[PDB]
Amino acid sequence: YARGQHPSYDMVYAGPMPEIFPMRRDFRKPTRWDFHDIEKQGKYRTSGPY
């Protein structure tokens, strides 16, 4: 390496870092804009999903 004859491994030779073990299902997290009555999302109460 010191005389510059060592075969280079640089960050240029790296492809994508793959997802190997797939995490988990991300279940839908209830937000303030998901409500079965249009009332619970009011203008006087709810200013946004969170």
Binding site: Y1, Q5, H6, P7, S8, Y9
Partner: protein, 50 residues
Amino acid sequence: ITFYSDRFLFRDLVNRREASYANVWEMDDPYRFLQTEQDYEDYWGDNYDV
């Protein structure tokens, strides 16, 4: 977004083509990717053991 020339890999190409190894273990050891101390510090930052 760097654009390399066509022959950009030549130096490394003749370095690889002319390499030689005492045994085959030296040929592919897992750690040939690493030269400086910065390399060893990036490769093991995860295990607080190592």
